[PDB]
mmCIF file of C-alpha atoms in Angstrom:
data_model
loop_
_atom_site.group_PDB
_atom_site.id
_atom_site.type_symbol
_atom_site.label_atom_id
_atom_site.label_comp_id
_atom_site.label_asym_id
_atom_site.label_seq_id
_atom_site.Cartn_x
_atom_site.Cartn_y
_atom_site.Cartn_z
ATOM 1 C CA UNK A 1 7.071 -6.592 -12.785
ATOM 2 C CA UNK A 2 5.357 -9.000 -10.344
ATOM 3 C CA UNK A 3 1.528 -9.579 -9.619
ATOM 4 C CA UNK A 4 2.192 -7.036 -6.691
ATOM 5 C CA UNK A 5 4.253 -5.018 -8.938
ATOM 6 C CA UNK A 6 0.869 -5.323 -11.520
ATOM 7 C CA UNK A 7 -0.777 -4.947 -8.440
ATOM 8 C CA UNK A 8 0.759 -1.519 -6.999
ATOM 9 C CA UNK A 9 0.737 -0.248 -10.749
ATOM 10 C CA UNK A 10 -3.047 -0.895 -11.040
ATOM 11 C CA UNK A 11 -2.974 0.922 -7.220
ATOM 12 C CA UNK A 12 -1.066 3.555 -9.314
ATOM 13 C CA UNK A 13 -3.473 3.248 -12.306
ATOM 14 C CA UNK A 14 -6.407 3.948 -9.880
ATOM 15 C CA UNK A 15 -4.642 6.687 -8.098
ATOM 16 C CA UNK A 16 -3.816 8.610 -11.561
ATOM 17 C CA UNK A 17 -7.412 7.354 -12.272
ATOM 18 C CA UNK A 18 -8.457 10.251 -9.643
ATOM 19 C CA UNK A 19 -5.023 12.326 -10.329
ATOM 20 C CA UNK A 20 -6.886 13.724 -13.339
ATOM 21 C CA UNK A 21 -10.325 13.985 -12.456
ATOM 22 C CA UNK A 22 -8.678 16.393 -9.470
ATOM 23 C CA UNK A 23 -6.514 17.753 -12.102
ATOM 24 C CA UNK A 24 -2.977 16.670 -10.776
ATOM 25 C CA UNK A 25 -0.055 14.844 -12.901
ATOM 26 C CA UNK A 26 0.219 12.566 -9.370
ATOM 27 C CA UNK A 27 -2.021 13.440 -6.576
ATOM 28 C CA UNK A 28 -4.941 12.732 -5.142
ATOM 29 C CA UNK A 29 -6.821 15.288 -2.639
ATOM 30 C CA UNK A 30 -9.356 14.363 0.157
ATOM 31 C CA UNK A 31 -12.117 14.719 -2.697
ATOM 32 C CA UNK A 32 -11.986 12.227 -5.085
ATOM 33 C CA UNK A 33 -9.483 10.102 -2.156
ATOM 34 C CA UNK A 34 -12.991 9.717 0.052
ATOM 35 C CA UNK A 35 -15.229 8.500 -2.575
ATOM 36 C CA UNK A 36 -12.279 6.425 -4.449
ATOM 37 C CA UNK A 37 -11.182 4.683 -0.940
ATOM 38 C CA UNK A 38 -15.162 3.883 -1.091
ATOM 39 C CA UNK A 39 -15.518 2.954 -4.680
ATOM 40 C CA UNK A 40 -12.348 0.747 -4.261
ATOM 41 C CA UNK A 41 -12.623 -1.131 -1.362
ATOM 42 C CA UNK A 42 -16.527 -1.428 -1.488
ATOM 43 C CA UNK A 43 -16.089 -4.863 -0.435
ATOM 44 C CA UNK A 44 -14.187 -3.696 2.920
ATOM 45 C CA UNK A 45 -15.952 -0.388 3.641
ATOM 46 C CA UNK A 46 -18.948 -2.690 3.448
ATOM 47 C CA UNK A 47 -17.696 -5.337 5.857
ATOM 48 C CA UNK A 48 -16.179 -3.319 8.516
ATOM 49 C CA UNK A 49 -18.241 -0.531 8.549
ATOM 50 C CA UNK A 50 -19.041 -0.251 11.969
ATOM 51 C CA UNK A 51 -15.765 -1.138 12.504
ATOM 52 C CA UNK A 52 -13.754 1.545 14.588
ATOM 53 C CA UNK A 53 -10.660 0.704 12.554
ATOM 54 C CA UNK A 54 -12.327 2.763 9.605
ATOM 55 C CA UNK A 55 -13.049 5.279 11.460
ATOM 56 C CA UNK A 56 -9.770 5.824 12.913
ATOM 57 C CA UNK A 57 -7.987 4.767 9.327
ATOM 58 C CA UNK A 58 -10.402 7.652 7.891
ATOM 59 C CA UNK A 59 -9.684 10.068 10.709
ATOM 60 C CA UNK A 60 -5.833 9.501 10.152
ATOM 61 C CA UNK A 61 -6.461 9.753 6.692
ATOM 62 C CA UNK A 62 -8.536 13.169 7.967
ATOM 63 C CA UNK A 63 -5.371 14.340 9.779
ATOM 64 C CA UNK A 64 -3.742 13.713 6.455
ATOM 65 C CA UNK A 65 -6.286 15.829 5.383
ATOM 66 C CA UNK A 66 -4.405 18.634 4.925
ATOM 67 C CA UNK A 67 -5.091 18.618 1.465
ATOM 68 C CA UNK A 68 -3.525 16.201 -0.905
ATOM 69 C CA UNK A 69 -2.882 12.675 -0.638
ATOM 70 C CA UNK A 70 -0.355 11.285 -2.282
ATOM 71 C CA UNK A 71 0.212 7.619 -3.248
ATOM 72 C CA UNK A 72 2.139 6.219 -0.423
ATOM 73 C CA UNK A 73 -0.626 8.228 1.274
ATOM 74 C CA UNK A 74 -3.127 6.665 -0.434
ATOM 75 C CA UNK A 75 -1.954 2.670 -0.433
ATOM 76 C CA UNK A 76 -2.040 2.885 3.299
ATOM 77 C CA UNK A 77 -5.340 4.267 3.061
ATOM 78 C CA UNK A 78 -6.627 1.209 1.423
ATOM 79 C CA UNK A 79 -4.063 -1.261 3.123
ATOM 80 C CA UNK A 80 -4.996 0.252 6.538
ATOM 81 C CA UNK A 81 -8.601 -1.069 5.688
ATOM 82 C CA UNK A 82 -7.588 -3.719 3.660
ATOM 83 C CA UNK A 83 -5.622 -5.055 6.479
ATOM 84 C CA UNK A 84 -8.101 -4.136 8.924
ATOM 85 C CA UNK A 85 -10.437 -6.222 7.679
ATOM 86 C CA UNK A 86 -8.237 -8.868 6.782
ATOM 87 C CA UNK A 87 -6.731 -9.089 9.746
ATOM 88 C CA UNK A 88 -10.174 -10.622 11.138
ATOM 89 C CA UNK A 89 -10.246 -12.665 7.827
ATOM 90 C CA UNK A 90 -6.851 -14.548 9.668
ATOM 91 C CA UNK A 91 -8.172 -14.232 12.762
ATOM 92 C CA UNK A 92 -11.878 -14.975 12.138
ATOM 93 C CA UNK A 93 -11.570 -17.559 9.481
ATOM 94 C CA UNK B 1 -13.570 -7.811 -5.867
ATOM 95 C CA UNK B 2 -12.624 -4.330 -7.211
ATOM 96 C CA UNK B 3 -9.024 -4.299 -8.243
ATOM 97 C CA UNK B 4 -8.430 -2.745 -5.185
ATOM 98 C CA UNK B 5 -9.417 -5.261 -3.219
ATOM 99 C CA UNK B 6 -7.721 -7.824 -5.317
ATOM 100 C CA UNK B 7 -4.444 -5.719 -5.717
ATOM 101 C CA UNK B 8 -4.543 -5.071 -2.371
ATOM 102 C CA UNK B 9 -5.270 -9.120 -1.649
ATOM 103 C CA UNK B 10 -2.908 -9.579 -4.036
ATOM 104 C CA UNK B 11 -0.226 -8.330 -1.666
ATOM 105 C CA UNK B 12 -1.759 -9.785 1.392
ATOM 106 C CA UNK B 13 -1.108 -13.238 -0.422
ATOM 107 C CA UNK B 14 1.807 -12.503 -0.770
ATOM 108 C CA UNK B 15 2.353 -10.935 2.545
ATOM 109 C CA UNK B 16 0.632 -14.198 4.096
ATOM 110 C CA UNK B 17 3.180 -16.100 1.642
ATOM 111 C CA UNK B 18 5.615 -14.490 3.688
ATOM 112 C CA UNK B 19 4.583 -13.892 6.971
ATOM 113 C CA UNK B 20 3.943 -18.155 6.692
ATOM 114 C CA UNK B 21 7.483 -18.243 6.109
ATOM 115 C CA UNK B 22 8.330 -15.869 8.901
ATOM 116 C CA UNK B 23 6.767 -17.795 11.241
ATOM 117 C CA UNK B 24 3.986 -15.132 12.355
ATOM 118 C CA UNK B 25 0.313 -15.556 11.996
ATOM 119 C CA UNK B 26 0.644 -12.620 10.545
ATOM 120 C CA UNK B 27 3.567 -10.251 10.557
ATOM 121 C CA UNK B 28 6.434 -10.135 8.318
ATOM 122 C CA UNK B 29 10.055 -10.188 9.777
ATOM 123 C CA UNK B 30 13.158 -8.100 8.276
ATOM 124 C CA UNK B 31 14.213 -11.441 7.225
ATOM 125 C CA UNK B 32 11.800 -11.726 4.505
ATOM 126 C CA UNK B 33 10.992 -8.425 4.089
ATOM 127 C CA UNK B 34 14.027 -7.505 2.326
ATOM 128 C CA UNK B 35 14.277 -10.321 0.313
ATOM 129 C CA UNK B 36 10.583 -10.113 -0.415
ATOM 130 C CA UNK B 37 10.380 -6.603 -1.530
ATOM 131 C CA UNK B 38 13.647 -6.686 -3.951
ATOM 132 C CA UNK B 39 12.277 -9.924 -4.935
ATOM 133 C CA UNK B 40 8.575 -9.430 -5.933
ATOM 134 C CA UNK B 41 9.236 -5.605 -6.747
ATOM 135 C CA UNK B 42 11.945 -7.003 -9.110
ATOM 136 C CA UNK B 43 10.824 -4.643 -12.098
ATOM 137 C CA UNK B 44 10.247 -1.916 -9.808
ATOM 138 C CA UNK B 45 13.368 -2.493 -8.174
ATOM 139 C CA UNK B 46 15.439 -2.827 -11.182
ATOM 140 C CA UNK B 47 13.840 -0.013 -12.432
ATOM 141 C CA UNK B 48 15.424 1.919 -9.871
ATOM 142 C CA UNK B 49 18.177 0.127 -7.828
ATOM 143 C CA UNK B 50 20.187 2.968 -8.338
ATOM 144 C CA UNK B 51 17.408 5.166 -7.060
ATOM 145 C CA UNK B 52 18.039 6.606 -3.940
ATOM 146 C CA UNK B 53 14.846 6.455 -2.729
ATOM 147 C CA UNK B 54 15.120 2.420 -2.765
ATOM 148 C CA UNK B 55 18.030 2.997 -0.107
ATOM 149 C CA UNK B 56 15.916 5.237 1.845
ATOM 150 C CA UNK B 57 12.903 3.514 1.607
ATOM 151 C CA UNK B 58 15.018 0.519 1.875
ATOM 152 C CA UNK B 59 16.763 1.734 5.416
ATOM 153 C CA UNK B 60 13.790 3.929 6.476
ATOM 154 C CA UNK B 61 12.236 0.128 7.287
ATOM 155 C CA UNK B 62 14.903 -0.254 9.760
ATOM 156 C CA UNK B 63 12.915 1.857 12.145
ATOM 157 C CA UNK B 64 9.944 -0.603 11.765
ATOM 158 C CA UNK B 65 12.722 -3.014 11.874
ATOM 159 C CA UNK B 66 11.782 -2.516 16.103
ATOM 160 C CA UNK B 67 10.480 -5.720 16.114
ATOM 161 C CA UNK B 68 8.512 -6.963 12.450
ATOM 162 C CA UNK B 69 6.868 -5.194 9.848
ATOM 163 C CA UNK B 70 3.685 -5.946 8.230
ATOM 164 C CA UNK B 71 1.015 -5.286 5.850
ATOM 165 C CA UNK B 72 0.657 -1.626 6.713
ATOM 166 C CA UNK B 73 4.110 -1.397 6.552
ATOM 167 C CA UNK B 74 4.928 -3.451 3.887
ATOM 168 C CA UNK B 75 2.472 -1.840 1.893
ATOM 169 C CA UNK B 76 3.993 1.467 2.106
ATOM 170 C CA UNK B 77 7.128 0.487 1.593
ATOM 171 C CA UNK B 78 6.423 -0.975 -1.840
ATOM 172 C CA UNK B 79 3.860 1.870 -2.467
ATOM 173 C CA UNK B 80 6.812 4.087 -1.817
ATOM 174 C CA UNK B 81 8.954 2.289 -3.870
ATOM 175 C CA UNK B 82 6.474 2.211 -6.510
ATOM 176 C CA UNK B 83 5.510 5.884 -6.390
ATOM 177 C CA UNK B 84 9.751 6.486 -6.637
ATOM 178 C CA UNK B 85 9.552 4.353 -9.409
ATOM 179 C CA UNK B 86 6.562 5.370 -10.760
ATOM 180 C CA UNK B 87 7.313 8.716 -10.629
ATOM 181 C CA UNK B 88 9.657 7.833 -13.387
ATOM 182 C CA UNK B 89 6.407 6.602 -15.220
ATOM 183 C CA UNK B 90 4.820 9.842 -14.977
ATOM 184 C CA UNK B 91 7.441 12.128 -15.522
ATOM 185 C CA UNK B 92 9.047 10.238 -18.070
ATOM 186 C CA UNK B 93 6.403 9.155 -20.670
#
């Protein structure tokens, strides 16, 4: 597999990472999910915190806060803010 | 620079690789989106070409096919293909 294929398997990694300490074989719930999406992407919470994107990213991450989170639910998690971010990383640069 | 953040980089390089060649600032068109994800999730995808998911997840970008798809998209459409994949990883180990 590719560095993104490394990449989305460490994404996986990380995701089982939290799997077990919630106690699923794949899942993660909106306990371990908030604190991981922190933990994780320290680096972006930090920069855009004040940033309404997060907000919005966590609220939409709140309205999939039904109760678990799955994996495809939880890359766009991080790639919402990851992106976020980014994006004014491209745009401021 | 949690592995996250450089996973998740990771595929914004590669998105960027991309979206460079798509022309956008930053958006990735269908034209490079299909090659891109069979390319780069080469393992994953030959993992499971046979999948159905991959056709699914492969058409079910033809509705963010409106106009281009990017890193939120592209993200979950590799996450999804890794997670169908993946699954396999779980389930059979």
């Amino acid at each position: 597999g590719s560095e993104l294929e490394t990449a989305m398997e460490t994404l996986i990694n990380v995701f089982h990472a939290h799997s077990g300490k919630e106690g699923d074989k794949y899942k993660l719930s909106k306990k371990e999910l908030k604190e991981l999406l922190q933990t994780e992407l320290s680096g972006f919470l930090d920069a855009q915190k004040d940033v309404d994107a997060v907000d919005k990213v966590m609220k939409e991450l709140d309205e999939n806060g039904d109760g678990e989170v799955d994996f495809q639910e939880y890359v766009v998690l991080v790639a919402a803010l990851t992106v976020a971010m980014n994006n004014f990383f491209w745009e401021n640069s």
